[PDB]
Amino acid sequence: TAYTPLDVAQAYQFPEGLDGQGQCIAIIELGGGYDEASLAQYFASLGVPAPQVVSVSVDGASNQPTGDPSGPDGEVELDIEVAGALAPGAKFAVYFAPNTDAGFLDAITTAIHDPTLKPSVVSISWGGPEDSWTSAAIAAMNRAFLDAAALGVTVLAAAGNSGSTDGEQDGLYHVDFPAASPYVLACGGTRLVASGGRIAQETVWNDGPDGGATGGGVSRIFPLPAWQEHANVPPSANPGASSGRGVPDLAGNADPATGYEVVIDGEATVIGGTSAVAPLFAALVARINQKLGKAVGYLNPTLYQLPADVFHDITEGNNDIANRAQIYQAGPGWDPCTGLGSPIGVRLLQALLP
Numbered sequence: 228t229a230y231t232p233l234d235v236a237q238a239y240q241f242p243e244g245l246d247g248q249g250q251c252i253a254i255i256e257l258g259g260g261y262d263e264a265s266l267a268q269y270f271a272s273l274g275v276p277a278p279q280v281v282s283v284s285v286d287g288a289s290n291q292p293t294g295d296p297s298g299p300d301g302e303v304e305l306d307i308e309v310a311g312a313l314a315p316g317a318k319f320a321v322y323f324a325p326n327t328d329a330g331f332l333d334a335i336t337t338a339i340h341d342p343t344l345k346p347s348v349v350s351i352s353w354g355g356p357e358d359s360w361t362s363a364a365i366a367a368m369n370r371a372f373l374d375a376a377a378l379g380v381t382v383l384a385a386a387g388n389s390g391s392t393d394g395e396q397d398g399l400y401h402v403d404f405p406a407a408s409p410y411v412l413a414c415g416g417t418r419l420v421a422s423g424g425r426i427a428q429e430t431v432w433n434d435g436p437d438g439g440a441t442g443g444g445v446s447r448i449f450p451l452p453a454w455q456e457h458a459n460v461p462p463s464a465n466p467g468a469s470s471g472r473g474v475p476d477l478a479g480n481a482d483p484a485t486g487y488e489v490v491i492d493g494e495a496t497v498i499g500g501t502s503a504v505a506p507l508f509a510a511l512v513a514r515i516n517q518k519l520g521k522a523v524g525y526l527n528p529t530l531y532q533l534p535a536d537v538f539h540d541i542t543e544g545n546n547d548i549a550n551r552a553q554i555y556q557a558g559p560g561w562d563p564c565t566g567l568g569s570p571i572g573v574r575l576l577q578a579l580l581p
């Protein structure tokens with residue numbers, strides 16, 4: 228199975244008649260590049276306008292396609308194609324920076340404060356284990372996300388593509404950063420079976436140690452935020468582990484088995500990962516912003532107080548690819564695999580109306 232981003236948009240009942248006009252979405256990139264022409268042929272294929280796309284150099288980096296679909300280029304054009312196909316009225320701003328703690332931070336700080344392009348949304352599909360960041364990088368990134376909240380900018384981050392261990396091989400469970408920041412909308416991954424615009428099945432993305440799985444779990448760095456106190460977040464599964472920020476907040480189709488029809492470095496292919504879900508929801512927020520005539524900005528506190536039927540609950544599966552422990556497991560309501568679940572577009576919009 229495969230979908231266009233349009234197909235996934237329909238299954239999650241994105242509100243129609245909104246193309247993100249008047250919004251600018253920033254996408255953070257730490258490598259590779261796009262060709263603003265291959266993007267144009269791709270969008271044309273979907274029958275949707277090619278949106279405007281501008282690149283921004285950060286810390287000496289720039290838009291440099293490496294030619295390898297398996298490399299950074301894959302993330303870059305996945306991010307622009309999925310969000311661009313769903314919010315084609317919006318302006319895209321692609322900030323390139325070196326793949327390190329400091330250029331990642333500098334990229335994020337730049338997009339957020341950018342007085343020229345002024346994005347109202349920031350989609351992020353890069354990260355690493357929260358315990359692998361420097362302390363000063365941690366704090367700086369959180370100050371930046373704090374700034375985003377003050378400026379009414381929604382920051383979305385992919386929760387990770389390597390299950391509850393997050394690519395770590397030390398035998399412990401770990402959460403990815405920046406998805407672990409409380410100030411980011413952490414995006415989890417599911418397997419979606421949909422048709423006729425109805426969700427037939429939706430479960431945790433888990434394709435074992437070889438096919439990847441959605442990240443998710445409990446932070447051992449950030450404490451359980453005030454607004455997550457009623458979402459029955461467990462302690463981290465690691466021995467001795469306290470209460471922390473539960474990851475993620477929402478989730479969407481991520482399973483390459485049921486992935487995204489994309490065009491990467493001129494080749495037609497089907498991709499997955501939570502890498503796709505932040506751009507997907509970045510387009511949804513932009514449609515909502517256009518509808519409300521105002522930027523919704525930091526959403527985390529509102530989402531966990533909204534009625535449950537705003538979301539499609541995932542209840543089945545786990546994101547454990549390290550062992551047979553099923554840590555963590557999906558369940559009723561919030562869980563450390565899919566958070567609140569997949570958002571239902573028209574209902575989210577409705578719930579935020581004045």
Ligand SMILES: [Ca+2]
Pocket residue numbers: 540541542557558559560561562565566567568
């Ligand atoms: Ca659930």
